[PDB]
């Protein structure tokens with residue numbers, strides 16, 4: 519798939535707001551993911567022990583990882599489709615080291631959309647959400663194809 523330039527501008531316009539507070543958005547998104555789909559928490563040996571939302575909110579390590587996640591994702595989106603080089607090491611570690619099934623990428627995509635909708639309603643109308651969804655679908659499709667190449671797929 520290909521996004522038009524107008525769709526990329528909608529994506530990067532709301533991302534510019536996210537970047538005003540990377541740590542806060544990273545926290546909100548990962549907590550959303552873990553609450554909504556507790557099974558994903560099990561993949562993080564680092565965080566598996568966190569029992570409540572309050573414990574998650576107080577973990578500086580979780581907040582650090584959320585910054586890491588959003589920085590990597592932002593670098594990818596800013597490539598506007600030309601993200602082959604950035605995707606390869608990400609696919610390799612998630613497929614081979616962390617053993618993350620493809621389905622869980624849909625779950626974090628959902629959490630990203632939820633959080634932007636909650637924090638940026640004026641910049642995240644129907645069209646901007648449609649564009650962000652397309653951008654994340656593009657990402658998931660490309661990462662899934664890499665998984666298959668690397669010998670995981672799934």
Ligand code: HEM
Nearest residue numbers: 558561562564586587590591607608611616618622623626
């Ligand atoms: C938007 C999708 C995602 C991005 C951009 C992302 C990015 C990253 C980055 C940059 C790292 C650190 C370096 C590396 O190991 O590659 C990482 C580590 C990791 N990610 Fe992801 N990730 C994503 C989705 C997920 C999902 C869906 C899960 C699990 C449900 C996951 C599980 C992990 C784990 C277990 C680690 C290692 C944490 C540790 O240091 O112990 N990732 N991720």
